Enzyme design. Structure first.
Site, PDB file in Angstrom:
ATOM      1  N   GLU A 154       0.848  -1.215   0.000  1.00  0.00           N
ATOM      2  CA  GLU A 154       0.000   0.000   0.000  1.00  0.00           C
ATOM      3  C   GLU A 154       0.873   1.251   0.000  1.00  0.00           C
ATOM      4  O   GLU A 154       0.567   2.215  -0.725  1.00  0.00           O
ATOM      5  CB  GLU A 154      -0.922  -0.017   1.217  1.00  0.00           C
ATOM      6  CG  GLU A 154      -2.046  -1.039   1.074  1.00  0.00           C
ATOM      7  CD  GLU A 154      -3.091  -0.726   0.021  1.00  0.00           C
ATOM      8  OE1 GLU A 154      -2.975   0.336  -0.652  1.00  0.00           O
ATOM      9  OE2 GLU A 154      -3.963  -1.592  -0.210  1.00  0.00           O
TER      10      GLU A 154
ATOM     11  N   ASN B 292      -7.512   8.491  -5.797  1.00  0.00           N
ATOM     12  CA  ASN B 292      -8.384   7.453  -6.423  1.00  0.00           C
ATOM     13  C   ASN B 292      -9.080   8.082  -7.646  1.00  0.00           C
ATOM     14  O   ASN B 292      -9.330   9.299  -7.645  1.00  0.00           O
ATOM     15  CB  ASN B 292      -9.356   6.893  -5.378  1.00  0.00           C
ATOM     16  CG  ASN B 292      -8.674   6.311  -4.158  1.00  0.00           C
ATOM     17  OD1 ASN B 292      -9.070   6.584  -3.015  1.00  0.00           O
ATOM     18  ND2 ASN B 292      -7.635   5.553  -4.426  1.00  0.00           N
TER      19      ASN B 292
ATOM     20  N   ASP C   6     -12.210   8.159  -8.268  1.00  0.00           N
ATOM     21  CA  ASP C   6     -13.489   8.789  -7.853  1.00  0.00           C
ATOM     22  C   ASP C   6     -13.299  10.154  -7.186  1.00  0.00           C
ATOM     23  O   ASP C   6     -14.296  10.733  -6.768  1.00  0.00           O
ATOM     24  CB  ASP C   6     -14.278   7.817  -6.973  1.00  0.00           C
ATOM     25  CG  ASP C   6     -13.755   7.644  -5.546  1.00  0.00           C
ATOM     26  OD1 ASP C   6     -12.620   8.095  -5.269  1.00  0.00           O
ATOM     27  OD2 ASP C   6     -14.490   7.083  -4.730  1.00  0.00           O
TER      28      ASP C   6
ATOM     29  N   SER D  67     -11.537  10.650  -4.320  1.00  0.00           N
ATOM     30  CA  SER D  67     -11.113  10.416  -2.933  1.00  0.00           C
ATOM     31  C   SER D  67      -9.578  10.246  -2.962  1.00  0.00           C
ATOM     32  O   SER D  67      -9.019  10.117  -4.022  1.00  0.00           O
ATOM     33  CB  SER D  67     -11.814   9.237  -2.299  1.00  0.00           C
ATOM     34  OG  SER D  67     -11.508   8.074  -3.014  1.00  0.00           O
TER      35      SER D  67
ATOM     36  N   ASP E 218      -6.236   8.205  -0.675  1.00  0.00           N
ATOM     37  CA  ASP E 218      -5.795   7.214   0.331  1.00  0.00           C
ATOM     38  C   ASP E 218      -4.592   7.751   1.115  1.00  0.00           C
ATOM     39  O   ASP E 218      -3.651   8.267   0.469  1.00  0.00           O
ATOM     40  CB  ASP E 218      -5.333   5.942  -0.361  1.00  0.00           C
ATOM     41  CG  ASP E 218      -6.440   5.069  -0.895  1.00  0.00           C
ATOM     42  OD1 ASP E 218      -7.612   5.357  -0.587  1.00  0.00           O
ATOM     43  OD2 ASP E 218      -6.098   4.046  -1.569  1.00  0.00           O
TER      44      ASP E 218
ATOM     45  N   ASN F 142      -8.837   5.304   2.802  1.00  0.00           N
ATOM     46  CA  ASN F 142      -9.481   6.225   1.830  1.00  0.00           C
ATOM     47  C   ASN F 142     -10.528   7.155   2.469  1.00  0.00           C
ATOM     48  O   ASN F 142     -11.445   6.703   3.195  1.00  0.00           O
ATOM     49  CB  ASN F 142     -10.106   5.470   0.663  1.00  0.00           C
ATOM     50  CG  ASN F 142     -11.399   4.821   1.067  1.00  0.00           C
ATOM     51  OD1 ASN F 142     -12.401   5.508   1.245  1.00  0.00           O
ATOM     52  ND2 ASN F 142     -11.357   3.514   1.239  1.00  0.00           N
TER      53      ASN F 142
END
Ligand SMILES: [Pt+2]
Ligand SMILES: [Pt+2]
Length: 129
Positions: free
Chosen positions: A35, A46, A48, A50, A52, A59
């Site tokens: 990650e 992301n 969309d 958003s 992380d 997120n």
């Protein structure tokens, strides 16, 4: 802060992640490696809108407030910037809520694609725990 592999394993164990909801410590270390590369300051956007945040890439769509993710939730009740600390407490506490929510560690795409079904014990091999 960029953790060493065994340093992060020790921190995660101290914070109660070893076999939390049945996920061995090597699962959480493997997830953090793929990650964030063990970097608490890691951030990634992301598709969309958003973002992380932190060592477990939590997120803003669901878990934290970053002030720029419209129509999102803040289920861990924290500013996303809290997740970037050298102190992994906030990330670990939020991760325990995430993994508890019904989907387990499948919430972490890197865990599903790179850790699930592998010999994750390798991630803690040699570590003083
Ligand atoms: Pt263990
Ligand atoms: Pt093995």
């Amino acid at each position: 802060k960029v953790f060493g592999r065994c340093e992060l394993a020790a921190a995660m164990k101290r914070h109660g992640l070893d076999n939390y909801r049945g996920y061995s410590l090597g699962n959480w270390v493997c997830a953090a490696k793929f990650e964030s590369n063990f970097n608490t300051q890691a951030t990634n956007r992301n598709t969309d809108g958003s973002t992380d945040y932190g060592i477990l890439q939590i997120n803003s769509r669901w878990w934290c407030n970053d002030g720029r993710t419209p129509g999102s939730r803040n289920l861990c009740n924290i500013p996303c910037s809290a997740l970037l600390s050298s102190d992994i407490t906030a990330s670990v506490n939020c991760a325990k809520k995430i993994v508890s929510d019904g989907n387990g560690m499948n919430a972490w795409v890197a865990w599903r694609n790179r850790c699930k079904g592998t010999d994750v014990q390798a991630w803690i091999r040699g570590c003083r725990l």
